[PDB]
Ligand binder design. Structure first.
Ligand SMILES: COC(=O)c1cc(O)c2cc(NC(=O)NCCCCNC(=N)NCC[C@H]3O[C@@H](n4cnc5c(N)ncnc54)[C@H](O)[C@@H]3O)ccc2c1
Ligand SMILES: COC(=O)c1cc(O)c2cc(NC(=O)NCCCCNC(=N)NCC[C@H]3O[C@@H](n4cnc5c(N)ncnc54)[C@H](O)[C@@H]3O)ccc2c1
Ligand SMILES: COC(=O)c1cc(O)c2cc(NC(=O)NCCCCNC(=N)NCC[C@H]3O[C@@H](n4cnc5c(N)ncnc54)[C@H](O)[C@@H]3O)ccc2c1
Ligand SMILES: COC(=O)c1cc(O)c2cc(NC(=O)NCCCCNC(=N)NCC[C@H]3O[C@@H](n4cnc5c(N)ncnc54)[C@H](O)[C@@H]3O)ccc2c1
Lengths: 342, 343, 343, 343
């Protein structure tokens, strides 16, 4: 009956919260120094946004952001967490002698009761490609607990798209699919499945990093203002794009990354997963075209990236792109729920 | 159905989604030991298939059914519960075998077969042989087997042996000691160190390793698929008494398995032992919480108890002791959540 | 009509003899020092096979082999050539003061008149893969002028086949065809032609050289004895093969090269185009499989290479190969008339 | 037919075999200047195609017919004489355009068209514009053109200019001097040196080059395809009077061409000039066998005479003189046998 369960299949949720119940996954996220250090800087350098304030930490995990809020002077922090990690967060609150200031509240943020409205919401809601996990909907849902002029850390998110050329990545995924081109694998003709194999492989977003030299145009930016967005905004995300090509060659797909900003009273602090910046546990994401497009420097590559949220806490991706000057058109569907970790 | 009574829905959804991918089929088909040995077992025992009725349990892409067709089978019922069943259909059509291979979507515990069969073929083995609890579906399928029908594979041998791997043992604490710092960005994490150690030690380690870490001849626990019942696999008690061949510290038990295709013409073996080329089953190792010192000639005795759970896997309870000294160790592990260490 | 024209399309012959009418092509063949030096050695070191003998030079071109025969003491050499190069040969015979000994006879060797029978035939009848050009049939046809005791230089030819692995060559030809995979080339769906494009590209034998590292088994040898063969023997050439694989991996096709032997009275001299030998203007030839075959070291790769002569002075190639242990079968057709020059 | 009267069978067979290959279509399609400019010319002049009847002469894969369809043509007759016609048919089906594009196999001089057309489109240009004598087929097709009708391309400009390239000139003799040796394996080849020089100089050099080798503003010879008759192209006389911008030795004449698509909305140009990005037409250079010294301000005058031959090409006769000194040079070249020097 909760907003969460209406939009989420049980089996997806079971797996999701089992995964985040493990201390090893917490360690993996916490040891990303860019991630953890930038969150600490954003909070501590904006200490006036926390001094004597009431805070909500959405999906707190081990509790680390709540401890930063306490270091910054927060009067009271409600730390909401739906996995079994909530019990471990409690252990740390006791052992850091902060029971008077951090209150763990087990459950889904769409389902728990909070005793009061809060001045500021903090969270790490970003998934791969920003939107994976559909955790941004829970962060926005939590605004029901935000006082009128309250703040959100992070405050905004920028998704960046850019066209890329990477023949080796293309031929790797292409070579895999041509396994099913074989007419006599131990005497068995597999070729009738070649098309279905190519489809399956090229639907997989490629999660890994890459040199910026593969980017063929300045990135296009789609911005979510978390102070203003509603959950429903994220069920169907339409991102138009028009790229002015800076290099001639084959376009093998689009690359995705994101930035978020903590717009504080004292300063704005940015956390970037761009390929120009040190690697993070978010890496970067690339959606391959099944057939590359040829473009000349100075051509425009235009189209639309459509993200449709699904009940597996992820998105179906539709990318339609064309070279305006020639009319070369490519349409592509990808399943962010089955990424290829390269 | 028998399947749903013993399986959580959420476990089954994930399980069959995973096997719905062609890439996972390709990963299994590319294992030359796995695919080549199944082909040899069937083709070299052609009299067990000529003009016979066959059941392929969990046929995936259909590959074992095609081998049965190459061997002269009159009719093959290929049962598959994932969406891979539709791809198997495509291949049957394109290999012009619709008159001989019938794909039947669904669980073998739930579908109807028109006919009793002469031989069941399947690949029911998981990690440590028993993971996935697919062996129960393979045995369940015997309700369709004619009296004196055969099973391919016919038996399975799970092998246990003690191992020494100081680096693997110490790696657990190096990972857990992440939590043993008093000011991680100002936060004392040390209260969680013990919980982290516990969590790493509950995970069996899927990996391969050099046979020089093995400290005694393996002990063998055998399932004869012609004779076993599903119920035999709900509680699997494997006693062991190891005569130690080397002195040193024993850090846990290593697992692998063999299966045999006992045909009329010959018996063909498929081995995942560490003395053999690697397979997609690798090997499995379960650590003790505290190592045991043993001398060459001592005996290390105890039991490995595998208790089936509703997550298509087993809870593993290992108790071991050095008889000559009384040094005792145990561990509890969740086979459903293995740690993939191979690189 | 003559034997040549009944087996040859006019349009093929016009082009063929126009090509050989050019001095630049003569230079290209003559500057191959292996080719020219070995022909000279074969003749001069077997001088007794030429001293005071009557010689026929089939397809003499510029006349070089006739001049070697004259250096070796031949009484008379009939130099037959069907291209306009016959007129340049004439010039050289007069400029080298050998008119009393070398008699150029313009025309096809299947059509000209020789005044007498000869003691020995010399020629360079080898094309790419030995058989291209169907010049070997003209060389054998010329035996009608050979005395009972007569000899032939070259005397025999060995064609060698061996399996090879060359992922980069395969992906190169494969990448070219996938141009026609495009669903919107300037708005035009080309993909319905993809299959026809792959066929066309993989029908092309690849002429170039390569490191012997890529060979996966000892070569198999097919021998033509020019003293004994008849023209008809070369209309349908069937080369069985059974390779014992020395390395595991993908087999992307078969590699071809040849040797010829000049079996003289004094010694036998060999001319090899093997990839273990210095490059010649014959290079080597490779026939790709559209789908490579996986084989293990110790497997056997067996099948047949079938060469069917066509009216374009070349051969349709059929290669059927299978990995005996798995039954993986590959069938391939190639047009030797349309080679891909990669060097 | 008009085609067979003017074309030797053997030339045509080879010509249409070459264009039968998808790889040659792909090579022409990948030339972005060629394909992009044709697309722009048609699409930007859409009013010349909307609901119109179109004839595509020598359509190959059909690409220009698809551009005409993108531009709204009611009906397109796509004529192609090679086997590529069958592949065009496949693409028309798979692009769901059978109601609008009709592929007609055969020579445009021999096929029937059911009706007159509003506009003819073709790519009739060969090297130096005229090679292949395809322009005569394009003009021949005007019998199907309505009185009002247009042609895409509408005109062609051939450009000639004098060039200096000492290294290109000397390269001829370096190659020929292979023959100038008195004992090549004992054989005096030198009598053929002059024949070799002649043969190299008869070949037009297909290559690109830096515009700084040009020594005078080009002279332009124009063919208006709306007005020319086939017979106009049997004997093409191009007078020239160059006003030399640089002093030096003139080693020959360089050739290139432009065509214009004169539409109702705009005129679009396709240039193969050396100042423009390279195309698969490159540029062509015809050497003089003796260079001419000229000073800046001198005039180099003469005639380039192109005589069509039955090999779908031209015999080229260039006669040039420096008016101020009387220094004359002649040259006879065969456009059918170009030398491809580009690397
Ligand atoms: C086999 O292939 C596949 O199927 C697959 C697909 C993937 O994509 C895979 C991806 C992986 N790794 C990955 O993504 N790493 C990068 C993580 C970026 C940072 N994520 C982050 N902090 N988000 C929020 C999380 C925290 O918020 C809590 N929470 C959520 N909702 C809540 C609610 N309603 N109330 C309260 N608490 C709630 C959670 O419990 C938790 O503590 C691994 C494996 C993958 C496998
Ligand atoms: C996040 O951590 C985790 O949670 C986790 C845990 C693991 O352990 C993970 C392990 C993996 N890899 C692995 O295991 N590799 C080794 C494979 C060995 C060979 N397996 C085999 N052939 N067995 C049988 C399967 C076939 O039988 C069908 N079938 C089953 N019942 C049926 C029924 N009732 N009717 C009809 N058809 C039925 C299935 O649909 C399928 O076609 C990867 C990821 C893993 C993740
Ligand atoms: C893809 O595009 C394509 O279509 C193509 C296909 C090719 O394959 C291409 C191949 C090329 N080059 C090549 O292969 N070079 C290496 C071979 C040299 C060694 N061969 C050799 N000496 N044979 C004998 C030749 C001499 O014997 C004469 N002759 C023949 N019969 C006669 C008769 N009945 N009476 C009298 N005289 C006769 C001839 O006139 C001549 O003087 C180039 C371009 C190619 C193009
Ligand atoms: C033997 O080896 C050597 O010595 C040689 C000599 C050369 O010179 C060599 C030259 C080459 N390369 C080259 O020339 N590149 C320049 C690009 C030209 C671009 N223009 C273009 N596409 N031509 C238009 C023709 C198209 O119209 C069709 N058609 C013709 N008439 C038709 C009719 N009556 N009805 C119907 N259809 C007809 C044809 O089938 C075809 O589709 C390569 C290799 C060469 C080799």
């Amino acid at each position: 009956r909760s907003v969460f369960s209406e939009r989420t299949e049980e089996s997806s949720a079971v797996q999701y919260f089992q995964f985040y119940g493990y201390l090893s996954q917490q360690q993996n996220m916490m040891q990303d120094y860019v991630r953890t250090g930038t969150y600490q800087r954003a909070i501590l350098q904006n200490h006036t946004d926390f001094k004597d304030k009431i805070v909500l930490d959405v999906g707190c995990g081990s509790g680390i952001l709540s401890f930063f809020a306490a270091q910054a002077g927060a009067r009271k922090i409600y730390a909401v967490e739906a996995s079994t990690m909530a019990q471990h967060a409690e252990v740390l609150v006791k052992s850091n002698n902060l029971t008077d200031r951090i209150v763990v509240i087990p459950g889904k943020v769409e389902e728990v009761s909070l005793p009061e409205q809060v001045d500021i919401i903090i969270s790490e809601p970003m998934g791969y490609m920003l939107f994976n996990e559909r955790m941004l909907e829970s962060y926005l849902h939590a605004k029901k607990y935000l006082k009128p002029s309250g703040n959100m850390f992070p405050t905004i998110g920028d998704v960046h798209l850019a066209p890329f050329t990477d023949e080796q990545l293309y031929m790797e995924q292409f070579t895999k699919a041509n396994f099913w081109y074989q007419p006599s694998f131990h005497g068995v003709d597999l070729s009738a499945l070649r098309g279905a194999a190519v489809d399956e492989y090229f639907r997989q977003p490629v999660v890994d990093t890459f040199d910026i030299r593969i980017l063929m145009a300045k990135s296009v930016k789609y911005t979510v203002n978390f102070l203003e967005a509603k959950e429903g905004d994220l069920h169907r995300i339409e991102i138009p794009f028009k790229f002015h090509m800076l290099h001639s060659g084959l376009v093998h797909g689009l690359a995705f990354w994101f930035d978020v900003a903590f717009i504080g009273s004292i300063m704005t602090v940015w956390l970037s997963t761009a390929p120009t910046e040190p690697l993070t546990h978010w890496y970067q994401v690339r959606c391959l075209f099944q057939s590359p497009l040829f473009a000349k420097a100075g051509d425009t590559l235009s189209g639309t990236c459509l993200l449709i949220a699904n009940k597996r806490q992820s998105y179906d991706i539709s990318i339609v792109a064309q070279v305006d000057q020639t009319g070369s058109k490519s349409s592509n569907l990808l399943d962010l729920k089955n990424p290829f970790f390269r």
